Design a protein around this ligand. Structure first.
Ligand SMILES: *[C@@H]1O[C@H](CO)[C@@H](O[C@@H]2O[C@H](CO)[C@@H](O)[C@H](O)[C@H]2NC(C)=O)[C@H](O)[C@H]1NC(C)=O
Ligand SMILES: *[C@@H]1O[C@H](CO)[C@@H](O[C@@H]2O[C@H](CO)[C@@H](O)[C@H](O)[C@H]2NC(C)=O)[C@H](O)[C@H]1NC(C)=O
Ligand SMILES: CC(=O)N[C@H]1C(=O)O[C@H](CO)[C@@H](O)[C@@H]1O
Ligand SMILES: CC(=O)N[C@H]1C(=O)O[C@H](CO)[C@@H](O)[C@@H]1O
Ligand SMILES: *[C@@H]1O[C@H](CO)[C@@H](O)[C@H](O)[C@H]1NC(C)=O
Ligand SMILES: *[C@@H]1O[C@H](CO)[C@@H](O)[C@H](O)[C@H]1NC(C)=O
Lengths: 483, 483
């Protein structure tokens, strides 16, 4: 009886219906673009029947209206709207695509409950729902700490329970390179913490398909030019050597052709491994020091007439990378610095705003320039604090920044980020849930859903539900669960 | 060979000795006051054999010098010192009491490591060790959230790995009364979150014996007169009705004869259930408004000539409870307010300093008045923050306050506290370890052990060892463990 996220339009009635575990079917409506050949739906039907059961409404008929997209990979443009008509003798779930059906199945399971005598019950009701924003993501960091594939899958399960639809996989960084590249086997061979802390091509396909079956996009992030210390272990001459030499290395060297030919071969591979339409190129916190200390780079700066402005060198670099992505049928997402340091961005390039200091203004600037924008700044869940910090994440109102409606339309969503300096398998799940659920509701539910007492009431029970489903979500406050 | 806490004296040699898993015995020296009939040692030998193994030193002989105390419960006066002589063919662990042997076994297990080829190895070495402080505790809160017995047992194991010797069990409080009382069945029947959220007499015995086998004291805290809301559900007319009329209640009513007869009977039961010599009476955050609003109490204040000074009414209450404890062969521990509010305490009453505003001065006052003191103030592990907060707990130097040497001798130790408003079985362990390990080394090791790099280096490996032993201790920073 606790809905989370709260659907767009909910109409409940005090009429009670009952379900019989051994005689309740989730089936395909005779009128549907999907049938038993639709693996995604067939698996969801079985999956949710187990989540639900561990007068009589004897069946839930599922009807997909338009071409189902059952065999496709979800996209930022995917329609996740759906309609739920709970009545006897047959309940009906209707949606334009399989994506909306997935969400509706989750909502339906949250409606079913057991009364005082253990009787499976559901109230007669009508639900009309659709997300406020299209990009609702969780960022995981598998470089600062390697995360076993199983916990990544458990995270995707929790994401589906919360209607998140994007897993921003910040797979590599300075400390380690777990991604196993087939065209460049020395990256992980030499950059991984160990050969037992790597993601084989199969581990990757596994995350991706498991995510697809839940309507979740897997956005890979291969951060450059900064945050690339671990890439140097296996790719010679990629990183920039620093000077008082020094045994220190800086960001990727943007003045070498070998750098671009390597990035060209590497991203062609990424374009073939990750089916998502987008590739996050990163571009955050590039340290200019080593570049400036390097003699050859000083000459390159002279030959290009960049003077002493290294943002131009950064821009030069990012623009060549951006161009490579553009030739491999992929879109690009970058951290705000790429935009702030005046790089020339092609239309459609998504900018992710992560810096907390006056981010509403950064939102105006980005959308003013006409670029799609994603907000993560107020949702750095790795920055833990004492108490109910879920309230501050919940209270955020993303569209509160100066701009026209056309500008506001460039805002496509946000992400709760769980960077890994202090996170691994021992503490990931409770740190992530239910704190991220606050971001989930703010990104899915209408802007007006803001009552804190009601939020607390539904979140408390949704958290217990996550625990009964095997997600070690931490408590909101003193209390207990009846599970 | 990552020792934690760092022993008092460690003399290491580069000579390597090796152990044969199938041919390595931990035995009673023929010269020892303990033998096979000593269950505590027999269980430890077995337990540590499994921890160690998941120029040959064939055996580790254990010699207890004075009366063993094998069948007793540990006490604040217990001698935990020991000596470890690691040499071939027989190593020797010698201690005055079994308590020191327990500590020695842990240290011995930390000296054994597997070399590059999986060979069990240990460096020839000599260790002389004893704790800097006698009271080294962890406070758990099973009221704000019920904790299944298994996580309490699990916590006791981690405490042993870290040389903690006191479990401060804040068993009840405002939100729930999990303790099952035989004399007062309704306290838990009506005050627990549910009947499946209680500690039966058997649950309590289990915690107590499991702790004893590890040289850990179980210190019970039944907080009064404040923090007693749940006690009111099953014991009528115990709590003070507040007025202004009001279906509202405050702390325990100190003016009724029924209160003291009830507490006399209740604490007699506690003195029989918990073998530890001390009972923590609590006494923190007593709100006076409810008392002030009660007519009958106002009368009592008049009859007693207390005027409008309710601290006198508080002192009155706690002094009577303190007297009850004194008549049942137990000592008392109280939160600082009892001392601060000028209650008359008998010699030997221990005062726990928990308020962090100028706690060093509070330490000065308490010891100046001649009372033993325990510090928890700077170690509130429930108050989480971003990053390596383990370092701030580690940097604390407890004896840095004004006082003579005699005053300083009254400081008997401290506790790392993990209050439960935001803690239950889903997040307790990773939140508690290795953060509490910092406090563990400050309370055990000498005052001069303060190098941060060395601490970081040993803690990091100690944390991996904890994970290996089944404790989901969270990471200190980026990295990995050689699983
Ligand atoms: C689902 O239906 C039940 C009715 O069977 C609703 O429960 C009733 O709630 C109202 C007001 O809260 C009470 O007056 C009734 O006593 C309840 N029913 C019973 C058992 O008599 C329940 O509120 C409905 N769900 C929602 C949220 O609409
Ligand atoms: C335990 O013994 C080993 C081996 O004698 C010590 O390690 C040697 O340390 C020296 C100098 O630090 C190195 O040159 C050797 O290469 C090491 N031996 C090995 C493993 O090849 C080790 O220091 C001793 N342990 C302690 C803490 O004293
Ligand atoms: C865009 C981004 O967040 N970059 C870095 C940062 O500034 O903070 C995080 C920790 O909070 C780090 O993990 C990231 O590497
Ligand atoms: C002595 C003591 O700590 N008393 C209260 C407090 O002030 O802080 C804790 C939370 O940090 C609460 O759980 C305790 O009930
Ligand atoms: C399918 O559509 C037809 C025609 O609109 C209608 O008569 C029939 O009742 C529908 N069947 C179901 C199960 O919805
Ligand atoms: C026990 O003590 C005796 C007498 O001091 C000594 O001879 C013997 O070696 C000791 N045994 C062991 C195993 O330490």
């Amino acid at each position: 009886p606790a809905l989370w996220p709260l659907p767009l339009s909910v109409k409940m009635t005090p009429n009670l219906l009952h379900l019989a575990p051994e005689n309740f079917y989730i089936s395909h409506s005779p009128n549907s673009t999907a049938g038993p050949s639709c693996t995604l739906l067939e698996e969801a039907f079985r999956r949710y029947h187990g989540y639900i059961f561990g007068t009589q409404v004897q069946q839930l008929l599922v009807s997909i209206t338009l071409q189902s997209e059952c065999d496709a990979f979800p996209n930022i443009s995917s329609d996740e709207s759906y309609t739920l008509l709970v009545k006897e003798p047959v309940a009906v779930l209707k949606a334009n695509r399989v994506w909306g059906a997935l969400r509706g199945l989750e909502t339906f399971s949250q409606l079913v409950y057991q009364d005082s005598y253990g009787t499976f019950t559901i109230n007669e009701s009508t639900i009309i729902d659709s997300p406020r924003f299209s990009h609702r993501g969780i960022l995981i960091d598998t470089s600062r700490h390697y995360l076993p594939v199983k916990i990544i899958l458990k995270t995707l399960d929790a994401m589906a329970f919360n209607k998140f639809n994007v897993l921003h996989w910040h797979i590599v960084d300075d400390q380690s390179f777990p991604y196993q590249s087939i065209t460049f086997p020395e990256l992980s061979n030499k950059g991984s913490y160990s050969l037992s802390h790597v993601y084989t091509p199969n581990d990757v396909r596994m995350v991706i398909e498991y995510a697809r079956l839940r309507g979740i996009r897997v956005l890979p992030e291969f951060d450059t030019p900064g945050h690339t210390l671990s890439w140097g272990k296996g790719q010679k001459d990629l990183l920039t050597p620093c000077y008082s030499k020094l045994d220190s290395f800086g960001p990727i060297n943007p003045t070498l052709n070998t750098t671009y030919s390597f990035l060209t071969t590497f991203f062609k591979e990424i374009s073939e491994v990750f089916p998502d339409q987008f590739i996050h190129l990163g571009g955050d916190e590039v340290e200019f020091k080593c570049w400036e200390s390097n003699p050859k780079i000083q000459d390159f700066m002279r030959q290009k007439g960049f003077g002493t402005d290294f943002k131009k060198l950064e821009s030069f670099y990012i623009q060549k990378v951006l161009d490579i992505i553009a030739t491999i049928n992929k879109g690009s997402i970058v951290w705000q610095e790429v935009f702030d340091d005046k790089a020339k961005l092609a239309p459609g390039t998504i900018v992710e705003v992560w810096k907390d200091s006056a981010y509403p203004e950064e939102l105006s600037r980005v959308t003013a320039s006409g670029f799609p924008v994603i907000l993560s700044a107020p949702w750095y869940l790795d920055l833990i604090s004492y108490g109910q910090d879920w309230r501050k994440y919940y209270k955020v109102e993303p569209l509160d920044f100066g701009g026209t409606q056309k500008q506001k339309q460039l805002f496509i969503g946000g992400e709760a980020c769980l960077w890994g300096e202090y996170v691994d398998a021992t503490n990931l799940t409770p740190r992530l849930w239910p704190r991220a659920s606050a971001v989930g509701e703010r990104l899915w539910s209408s802007k007006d859903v803001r009552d804190m007492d009601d939020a607390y009431d539904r979140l408390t029970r949704h958290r217990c539900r996550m625990v009964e489903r095997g997600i070690a979500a931490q408590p909101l406050y003193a209390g207990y669960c009846n599970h």
